[PDB]
Symmetry: D2
Subunit: 281 residues, 4 copies
């Protein structure tokens, strides 16, 4: 069966129907779905009442999945993380970020399923690093290509938010010790498509190390604004049993925090990635 | 008939059905539509195949309408402006702005009808000055309340873009002479609801005159970024015969320029406004 | 003897003669010196061939002395910092800072003596927090008055600069434990003159806690630039045996790093102040 | 006679004695003065009781002189600007600028003489475009080299400052007509030494035309701040009959406005340069 794929804009986003994600997909179907994620960077399917087991199986056709000990997981399925936000667990994703870029091999992508939603709010936005790179002037494309930038766990999890108790402070210290800052290319080459994408994000990028500190502040301030250009984005208003699949190698996203005290439950499968690299054009 | 009103988020935006905009509305219907625009700041109705005459009549129930000599208007209807963009007439609304704030009485609102659309692209976004004001810390709310800022035609229409011919340059000079910069409150009190809203926009606001030049640059740089927070916004993907009605007193908007060389035709009715003022809380 | 006092500008700085600082001063001379420091914020005395022992003795007349947790001290004189810079110890004070604001009672004064100088370069600049406050617009004065900001030893002494050896990393660890981050007023009231002064500095101030994170970044970016205005400053070109004495309650300073591979040796004494406070007025 | 030349820093500034500038200099002395200006970028000579006529004569030895379109000149000496400031003519040069970069052949040099000074205040600072360029990272040097920027007379002489009378508004109108905006290289190659220097200045540079508007704002904001680094500068405290001679190809300067209501009178001569160019290297 041919999938129905409707682009949501010229640069990023598509809505897909004609694929039952609870049951196994044919190879032709999955090839279409795969290439649609590659091309449109994030795709959305609706009315997909998927179990954590079916979501794991779907995600595993893209690649192997992250398992966390720190987060709660679905009953009987370790690869599906339960993101259950409310007053006692406020959301922390209302900032432009690429997931876990402070490790050497950030996730290649994710599958996110909406399980329980507030009456309104909680939109999620994606922005295209490819479109943003292509919109830079030639001098800026030549400048940023080949530079390296530092990504640091502590930019999104700063020490001053973990002082409340001595145990909490020490747990933060241990996480920092396990996750020292490291470098990634400022312009990342997609390992399948070969497209060039900006690969800095306000969530974790602290410094472009191949320019001076003041030069870095100027460039990152510009770039963190540049990626907020509406032309580079798609915005999704969730309904229950929506599924979002996105490529974390060449996008950032932002999850609105505008629904507390209401409750919101998402199920996530994180697809493991490889080391980001830059291959000159 | 009671209107069906679906909010699109907790702070701004709603989709409305149950009102035929081609034919006259009952008073009860219009009271609902009016209060929904007031509350949700921008509202969207779909499948409204409205003629310019019917759009004028609808808009005139909100207030009297702007007539321009400079723009093309619909056949036989001067109050409906035809916005026909393409290669020879590129779009210029891809910047965060409040319409015509460089005059003493900026429009109170607008009704926009989608007539011909590109295959994809051309989304329009709105951001809430009310939500943005309420999200400032107390020191910033106290700081900005009562200040005045200069709005200048030339910020969106700078001289260097009008040098191509001597006639074009002189036409710009004449427009500038008719439209000198003037002041508006930084925090505007809505004249009906009494809500306080940020009332600066990157399109036209050049300087907060009650602080120093460097202080102004710092504050406006922060504020122009602050209003781009996704929680303050709604984003609309157009279909033909969509109608958008919005309150220009307490919002900004941004029209994506991501569809050239394709053609896009909108019909607009501009509702005249009064002088912005600030009334302390 | 009456002191000879020549102002170097309208807001900050004076050159003084008529006092031999290498030998005991009369109570009358000392009162004159003390009030000149308060009035001119930084004063300079030339041709003063002082020993570290004599420099400590003079500093003791102003109050109780501070022992720095990281910097090396002079042989047998624990209270005198030796700033001995060269290829093997590159300069560390080419940033705008107020000395030791990371403690509860930041130094009220300091005394600096030029011991060995390069053939050229190494100028030191002072900027007046009083002049900087008075140059703020009234709305900005009202904004900052009453706000508090965090000061952190580690901002100017980051861990990665102290990992060359176990000795220096352990000394760093002990300094951090004794000097946790703390708050000081953003506008400080001088305890003698009653004048208001800006009291943040880029060396140690990390964030303003009474506003949002993005608001804090905007305000500190402005303030760190504001104090670099030339009208707020005096610039000193050193000769051997110069002495500078300054009011560290209401100034910042900056030491040029433009002389390597040449060697430069200064001696500093550091006089504890009271707890900084703000008293509205 | 051999000139006595004392450098004031490693990068910029020297004090000179052994030359009477009020009387004719030997070709040998002149060569020494000329090469000192090139080597030290700005030089200072004290106790030089020069007349405007003598100052013009000395300036003529360097090249053809410029007559300023707006500033008043000395009686009977059209080439000597009188900068006579006080309550009725407040100072106008407390901004970082390179003199008269709004013409095709900006002055290569200038000569400033202190005629009447306030009791204190009014220091003038110079900053080196050569030092500032060398402090850029290689990627930033490569970025800016070859770019062009627009310079506009009106940035420092805006119309609203010249509407007090019809005479001054008409003089402004004629200056604008004779001095339209034009481009200069962002990195300028010194025509004698071959050194590269930054060649933008906040006084007249409006935008970098080879990048986007937002990219231009980011780069100019960085560059206008970069040149204020103290290591790039020399600061001069005037005495009557001082003379400053500087290489206006590769420096900027800034005149403190901190002495009103006291009166200050300086005389300037301004020597035309060649067309600024960039030669890669």
């Amino acid at each position: 069966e041919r999938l129905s794929i409707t682009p949501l804009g010229p640069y990023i986003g598509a809505q897909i129907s004609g694929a039952d994600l609870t049951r196994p997909l044919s190879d032709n179907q999955f090839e279409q779905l795969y290439h649609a994620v590659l091309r449109h960077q994030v795709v959305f399917l609706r009315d997909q009442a998927i179990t954590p087991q079916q979501q794991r199986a779907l995600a595993q056709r893209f690649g192997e999945l992250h398992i966390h000990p720190v987060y709660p997981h679905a009953e009987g399925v370790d690869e599906i993380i339960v993101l259950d936000t409310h007053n006692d667990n406020p959301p922390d994703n209302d900032n432009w970020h690429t997931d876990v870029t402070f490790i050497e091999t950030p996730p290649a992508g994710a599958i996110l399923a909406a399980k329980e939603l507030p009456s309104t709010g909680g939109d999620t936005l994606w922005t295209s690093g490819i479109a943003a790179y292509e919109a830079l002037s030639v001098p800026f494309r030549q400048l940023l290509s080949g530079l390296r930038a530092e990504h640091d766990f502590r930019k999104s999890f700063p020490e001053y938010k973990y002082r409340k108790t001595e145990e909490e402070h020490q747990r933060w210290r241990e996480a920092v010790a396990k996750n020292p800052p490291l470098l990634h290319p400022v312009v990342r080459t997609h390992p399948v498509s070969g497209k060039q994408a900006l690969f800095v994000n306000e969530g974790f990028t602290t410094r472009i190390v191949d320019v001076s500190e003041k030069e870095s502040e100027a460039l990152l301030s510009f770039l963190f604004a540049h990626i907020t250009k509406p032309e580079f984005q798609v915005r999704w208003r969730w309904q229950p049993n929506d599924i979002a699949i996105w490529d974390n190698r060449v996008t950032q996203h932002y999850a609105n925090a505008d629904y507390l005290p209401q409750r919101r439950i998402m199920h996530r499968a994180t697809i493991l990635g490889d080391k980001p690299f830059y291959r000159a054009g």
